Design an enzyme around this catalytic site. Sequence first.
Site, short mmCIF file in Angstrom:
data_model
loop_
_atom_site.label_atom_id
_atom_site.label_comp_id
_atom_site.label_asym_id
_atom_site.label_seq_id
_atom_site.Cartn_x
_atom_site.Cartn_y
_atom_site.Cartn_z
N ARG B 32 63.73 29.06 -107.78
CA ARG B 32 62.48 29.81 -107.87
C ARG B 32 62.24 30.59 -106.59
O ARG B 32 62.29 30.02 -105.51
CB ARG B 32 61.28 28.89 -108.10
CG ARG B 32 59.93 29.58 -107.93
CD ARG B 32 58.85 28.71 -108.53
NE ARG B 32 57.53 29.28 -108.33
CZ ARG B 32 56.75 29.04 -107.28
NH1 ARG B 32 57.09 28.15 -106.36
NH2 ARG B 32 55.61 29.70 -107.17
N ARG B 73 39.06 36.51 -104.74
CA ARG B 73 38.88 35.74 -103.52
C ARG B 73 37.62 36.20 -102.80
O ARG B 73 37.24 37.37 -102.90
CB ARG B 73 40.10 35.84 -102.56
CG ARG B 73 41.38 35.28 -103.20
CD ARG B 73 42.45 34.88 -102.19
NE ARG B 73 43.18 33.68 -102.61
CZ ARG B 73 42.85 32.43 -102.26
NH1 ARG B 73 41.87 32.19 -101.41
NH2 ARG B 73 43.52 31.40 -102.78
N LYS B 220 52.52 31.72 -116.88
CA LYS B 220 51.84 30.63 -116.18
C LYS B 220 50.43 30.50 -116.73
O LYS B 220 49.68 31.47 -116.79
CB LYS B 220 51.82 30.86 -114.66
CG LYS B 220 53.22 30.85 -114.08
CD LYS B 220 53.29 31.43 -112.69
CE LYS B 220 52.75 30.49 -111.68
NZ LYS B 220 52.74 31.20 -110.39
N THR B 278 53.47 22.21 -110.25
CA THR B 278 52.44 21.95 -109.25
C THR B 278 52.12 20.46 -109.19
O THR B 278 52.15 19.76 -110.21
CB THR B 278 51.15 22.74 -109.47
OG1 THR B 278 50.34 22.16 -110.50
CG2 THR B 278 51.47 24.17 -109.85
#
Lengths: 462, 462, 463, 463
Positions: B32, B73, B220, B278
């Site tokens: 990855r 953000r 994802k 994760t």
Amino acid sequence: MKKTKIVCTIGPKTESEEMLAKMLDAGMNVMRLNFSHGDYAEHGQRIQNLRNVMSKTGKTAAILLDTKGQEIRTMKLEGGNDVSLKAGQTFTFTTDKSVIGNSEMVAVTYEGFTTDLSVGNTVLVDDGLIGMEVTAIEGNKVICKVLNNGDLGENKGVNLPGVSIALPALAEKDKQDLIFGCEQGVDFVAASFIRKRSDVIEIREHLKAHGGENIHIISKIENQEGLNNFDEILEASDGIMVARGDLGVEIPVEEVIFAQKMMIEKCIRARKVVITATQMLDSMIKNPRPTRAEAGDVANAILDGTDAVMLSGESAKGKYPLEAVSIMATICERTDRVMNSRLERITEAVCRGAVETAEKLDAPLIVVATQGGKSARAVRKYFPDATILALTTNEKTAHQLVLSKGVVPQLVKEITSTDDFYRLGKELALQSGLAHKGDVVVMVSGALVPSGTTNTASVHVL
Amino acid sequence: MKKTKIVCTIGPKTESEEMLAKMLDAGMNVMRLNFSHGDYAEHGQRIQNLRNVMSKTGKTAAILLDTKGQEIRTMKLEGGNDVSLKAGQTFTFTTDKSVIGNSEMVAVTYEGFTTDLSVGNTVLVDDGLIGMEVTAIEGNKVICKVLNNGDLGENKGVNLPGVSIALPALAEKDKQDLIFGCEQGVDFVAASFIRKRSDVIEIREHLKAHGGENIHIISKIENQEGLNNFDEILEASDGIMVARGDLGVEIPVEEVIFAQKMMIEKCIRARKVVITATQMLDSMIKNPRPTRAEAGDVANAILDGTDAVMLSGESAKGKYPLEAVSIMATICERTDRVMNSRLERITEAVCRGAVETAEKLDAPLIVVATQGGKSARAVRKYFPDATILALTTNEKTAHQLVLSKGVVPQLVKEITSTDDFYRLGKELALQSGLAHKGDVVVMVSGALVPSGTTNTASVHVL
Amino acid sequence: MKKTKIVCTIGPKTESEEMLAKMLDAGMNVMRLNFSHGDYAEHGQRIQNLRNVMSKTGKTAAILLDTKGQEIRTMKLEGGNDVSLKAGQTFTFTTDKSVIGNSEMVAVTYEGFTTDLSVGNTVLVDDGLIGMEVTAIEGNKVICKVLNNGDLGENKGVNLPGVSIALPALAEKDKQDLIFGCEQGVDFVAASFIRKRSDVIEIREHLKAHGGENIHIISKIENQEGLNNFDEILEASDGIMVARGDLGVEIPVEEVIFAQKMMIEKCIRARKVVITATQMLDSMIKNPRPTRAEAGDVANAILDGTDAVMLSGESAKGKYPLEAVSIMATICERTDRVMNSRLELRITEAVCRGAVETAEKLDAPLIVVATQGGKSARAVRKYFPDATILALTTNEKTAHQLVLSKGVVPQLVKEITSTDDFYRLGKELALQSGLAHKGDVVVMVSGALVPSGTTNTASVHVL
Amino acid sequence: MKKTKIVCTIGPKTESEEMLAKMLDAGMNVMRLNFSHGDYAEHGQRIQNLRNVMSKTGKTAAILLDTKGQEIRTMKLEGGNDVSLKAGQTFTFTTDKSVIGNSEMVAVTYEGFTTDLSVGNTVLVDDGLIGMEVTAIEGNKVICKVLNNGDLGENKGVNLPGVSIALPALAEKDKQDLIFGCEQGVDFVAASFIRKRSDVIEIREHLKAHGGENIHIISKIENQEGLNNFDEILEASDGIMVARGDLGVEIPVEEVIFAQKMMIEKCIRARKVVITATQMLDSMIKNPRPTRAEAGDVANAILDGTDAVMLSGESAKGKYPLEAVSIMATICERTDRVMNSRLELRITEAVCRGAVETAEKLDAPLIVVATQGGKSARAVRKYFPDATILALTTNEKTAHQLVLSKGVVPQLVKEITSTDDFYRLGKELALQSGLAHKGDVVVMVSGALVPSGTTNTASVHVL
């Protein structure tokens, strides 16, 4: 909702009547008293407070006493200063308790260290932080090669994978602690570091000697030896506490998931209650929500088939006890919702048939008559969709059943005949709110049999 | 051995030829590249190094490119100082990027904040550390009530549960990053923060425009919107990355376990590869062994049925990369060992029948002819005990199959007939070491059919 | 459609080409020539007539030669008159063929009667009408106690339950009849009173010596001994004729149903053809409709799982030949219609079982099978598929023999050189057969790179 | 062991106490009195003789009264001579009973012949030997085209397939016969030619008016109409007599096997007793052993799942009564032995199914059932348990009726006041019955706190 039961360790933040009431409201079923700490007065008052809440609200909880148990520990270091041990160095343990330690040697609490170990054995110190290989055993010294860098503090735990330790089940502390539980009439004793069948026997023989013949022994499987002797330990115990965190210290980490699953499976098969404990929601000691990892591990233990899950520090000393019980209760409800029945002795045939019948007739409730709790536990085995209402004249049995998955105990005056059981069971089904006019209920009992045997199943419309 | 495949994020500690070789030896299947960081030269050299190792050792890996993606953000604070927000206070977000923040207001990177939100919506800041309720929306300001105490640092993530965000699939960065993957001939693109079907389409249309029509898109699923649109996202993608940690931020925590399980199940049903990612072995960034909790979560994802598991920092920046791959590989082997076949379209009938036959004749190997990989993936669906040897003339297909559970790809010259496939497949079965003289093998292929269809199964003794 | 195959005995009433043509129309699949009667010319002409019809219509039938076999019989009586034997009396059999009989003694045709029997054995006369217990054996006499009243006529059949008769499987007549069968290229030989494995071997060796190694032997289970040795017999044979009426003489009557069912089950498991024969529609020799019991018995044999059913006198000498074939075919169609497939180590078994499981899962009307010897078509039939089986072969004997197997449509073809060629041409032949149409799914079964006798490949195609 | 129950028709050969006693020994469970023949004295005495034997031996049988019913028949011919009817000819039926017949015309017994038929209907004469198509109906004549050659004798039965005959279920004879049945306290009435639900109601109301509300009605399905209305008939009846021979006259012969099987299946699902009757062992009227086909047919009816099988002439007038009962019982024992239980909304069903599933899981030889009306014993039998069923009842009619249900042993007892008393005494009676012994497991089924008709309780005990 939930069927899975919640054990809560009670401590200062949660010992008051007000707090215990809020705990039960949030989902607590069983009070755990951890006798590693506190004295008899503290613990006595926790017992009294819960019984006060129980009497006031009519709610039913059980009380479980958790022994400190026997542990091997390192002792003291010069000045109380940590020391750095370097991989490759020689390091020596000694049974000489007078010895204050340093980077070359430390005393251990166990006189039998020089006996039970052999050259080549592994010694793990401080939750397996530091590993060591025994290279020589001379007099009171066990000489070792340090296998990895680590820092040694005072009074740390010592683990001896795949070595049988000759420690007795009970410390003098635990003997007195157990008598207190008998005097107080606790429902369960949870015994720490059970290694073998004889450990359970010694505990049983101590309780029978103090009027505790009806106290259920929940053996804690916390190390390699207990896991190896698990079948005989199960056969001798009333239930099992699977302590993954401690077990993880001694066995290959990839194996722990499958040890848990095996143990839960065998307990279910044996009609014996099992608690999944340690490392459940520890992060909530400091935080108001659990981690994702924490919620998923708990749910997977419920899918494995656990009867109960346990909170430790979260509910005893943590900032957010009520929150931990509530989210534990939510995870139970969410996960129980989506489980199914498992339908694969006379008792087994009848109880299995009773759940299958219940499911075929869409019965919200299985009503059971039990003196000792076995028949309620024999029905629970098949993970029924229906709730189990256990009618008993035995108050201890009513408390103990609180721990079993999906059981609502009910205390009653002695029931004199099978037909009387149907009459009264039907009325108690309605009074419980668990079923209504028109619902079908299945009623399980023993007719003309020595207790321990369940042989009758009957279908009634409320 | 294991069948479950291992993705490894490569970073500075693991980018050299020597390190990649040791990684493959330890169990790595897929490299990855995380394009949140590094530049084209760094990443280009990682690609070159692995191909050098591949060519030297004859081993086969795949290369997956992971886009940075679009995120909302918070921005800057006066002096770069954290600020303490108190539950109950008003706090205001603004789309005005010129604004440096303080305890009353902060700028957010997304101009559409005032559009997509509504009064009553929840705003989560910094991995859901701080929660807030929108109370008013005026001009460029979203006015909120702070729901819990927390400290606000600079440049933190913003999550908008159950609000559809109108961000495009691709940043300008991601468009250039994707062209680079096409130029480099990566096998997979993993796209961050996929919210809906059109996001996947936009990615596909960008890759087709640069010669990447054969690059598999792994979407994802990282938030509430992606989960809600999961069926259409699956239908449009080639596979799925389940990112539990990110998803946990936006959805009720008790639900995450069941979202993972649902997604893996649907991918398997769809013959599409799925990666569980994760919070796998994060503790090994600093520590040479994983926690018990970590090993159990991974094993449970494999039992859920994942094709692959992924290491992130553990292997990219951590002190103990090789150790993490090895123990990941051990958990795969330990868990795969104890899984079973799941036997419940022409393609489905034939492939399902092929695995059932294999199991009845105790065949160690199912040999498959595939151009695009579908038939190898259709066999994998039923979790065969037998290993799958996928023969293909297509090099991209050979690389992509490395990610699919239990598949050993093999590149070959074009096979001209069904009987030629049996002859050569038999010889390649022996040369692979996966089977021996006397073993039975089942051979799956498409005869006289448009590609995409598998319709033939044949039993041969080596 | 029907799947169940029909064997018809041909005699004077049905031997013309006109009649055979109508017989085929009505449902006849296989001509039985009974060598208990007729001489070679009659039988030769029946064969020629059917092949003429086959040639003219393009229809496929098989030809089965049924031997007379070895029989033990009583012989003649004074005046040709019946005699009444009284329970309790002494009665004596003699091997002296010159003896004209009476109420005390009669001759038997078998010179070894005095050898193969023992004191205490039971002797049954005239299809078990009269039973007798042996009390003494002196010289050429078998002396007996008559167990029940009855009338003894001339030339009646003798049964010796649980006595092994020491005659070879084939009499002189039978050896000559089989040589004729080889001359005529018959597809099957049905051998009477098969008692044991060696009987089957004697027949196998005889046919091989005369160019008939490819002729399939159907062993007829007609007595206790055969039944006791049934496993070893099936193992040595290519198929079985369940002759319930003859079996009924020698075993307890309540056992015959279960003997029939067991023997059919075992033949199905062995991939070997089975015929249910004797006492099917006999009443139709005289009457144009069968009895309810008759039609019920045949259907129950079909539900038991027989490949074929057999007409005897009904179709050979009786007054309503075409009617008997016709209602027999209706009973087949009505009974096959409601049957189901049966899905249950060997490669061939795994593949064939799977090919039927797939066929049913994909609602496929046709399974197309490649065969040299017929084995693979018979392995698919084992699981009672809903689909018809289309068997492609280059072997003509196999094409004919498969006509007896339930649900099989043989097709002769030029050699097929590869598996993919088998698919291409298999698909074309499926459409041409009418058994399937554009859009249907078919499952195609064959052996790739294997010794013939092994089936290892199954493939799904849309026509 | 046997479980299958045996109905025997009693006639001159079997009416003595000696004979009935031997009949019971051989396996008779239920006496059938056929009211096609004999007068009330004969039948009254048969009843008395059996009750004498029952009283002397302590054995339990039931008594079934079978009505003659409504028949249509042709009448007389000139000289009493048969006449030959030729296919193609005109032939005429007349309702004028004075008409002595010939080859052009004959009288029929039914005055409504001219009403209930229509042009195009088929008329079958002499068990369907001769068929005819109606071409015209003029005055008292039904004019017909003869469809096939045949000989017509005197007083032959007429069948009218798919024509609803407008006669009531009960003729004058039948109403009087049922009054006699009430007088005699018979356990069952079997009613001939039941065609529709209202027929069953007419019989129910008649029996109730004469104190027979507790007599179980077994409807006889003997024709097309009955078969078409079979569901509504079963729903109204307590049980079914499958009369295959009569049914065979009117429906396609290939359909009879499936009518028999369907009707038995549905009766089993309904918890209602079924008898398979007609053409069982008829050959034994003249012969001491049945035919192979006969024994095979009976066993196949048992495997179909019938509760009972019936002897007719075999046991009433024939030469070998005891032999027929005996081999019938052997066929039962041999066939029941190899059957299996069948495990497959209602409380009663759930509990009874479970009680059999438990019995088999615990290898229990006996299931003990408490019944007032017989319903719960019949709900357990539905699943073909290996275990024998011991049914305890305070009701004598129920004790007798249950004798017809497969695998049931009734026992009369004093009232049982509670569920636990049912266990105590149930266990004692299990040992006393000989059906089970110390150490055996028994499963005990009953209704606790429910309306009778509901079974809700199952309990496992070791004797």
